[PDB]
């Protein structure tokens, strides 16, 4: 899901990549913890 509007609802995750062993997970539009949105966040990212 490539858009904040599509990333709603639930989806399945497969443990160890086994298609017969899945769990439900609510999908959420997440932001990276170190990003480049302003010069302060960009400077923090470049510091790391």
């Amino acid at each position: 899901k490539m858009t904040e509007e599509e990333c709603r609802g639930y989806y399945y995750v497969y443990k160890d990549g086994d298609p017969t062993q899945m769990e439900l997970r609510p999908r959420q539009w997440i932001h990276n913890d170190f990003h480049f949105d302003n010069v302060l966040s960009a400077m923090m990212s470049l510091f790391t």
């Binding site: 709603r8 639930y10 989806y11 769990e23």
Partner: protein
């Protein structure tokens, strides 16, 4: 949402509501899209034909419309056998 009354019937060994139709949407299909909400809108007119079919021949079992978008609108209304995450057991049912 609608909170039905769910009398218990024969010919379905489960509690059933003859007042409206129930809708199933696959677990990983968001209910709230503009493709899904545009289907729950025009499929809302099947309910009075479901009722008419059922009252002309009361011997009639499930009547279902299975959509090319994943929806399944069936009559009479009855709770699905498997809620996805309300209990632990998830359901994998696609009408397609």
């Amino acid at each position: 949402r609608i909170k039905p009354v769910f009398i218990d019937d024969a010919n379905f060994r489960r509690q059933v509501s003859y007042q409206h139709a129930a809708v199933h949407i696959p677990t990983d299909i968001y209910e709230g899209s503009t493709i899904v909400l545009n289907e729950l809108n025009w499929t809302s007119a099947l309910d009075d034909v479901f009722k008419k079919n059922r009252e002309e021949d009361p011997s009639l079992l499930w009547q279902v419309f299975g959509s090319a978008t994943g929806l399944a609108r069936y009559y009479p209304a009855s709770p699905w056998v498997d809620n996805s995450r309300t209990p632990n057991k998830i359901d994998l049912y696609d009408v397609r």
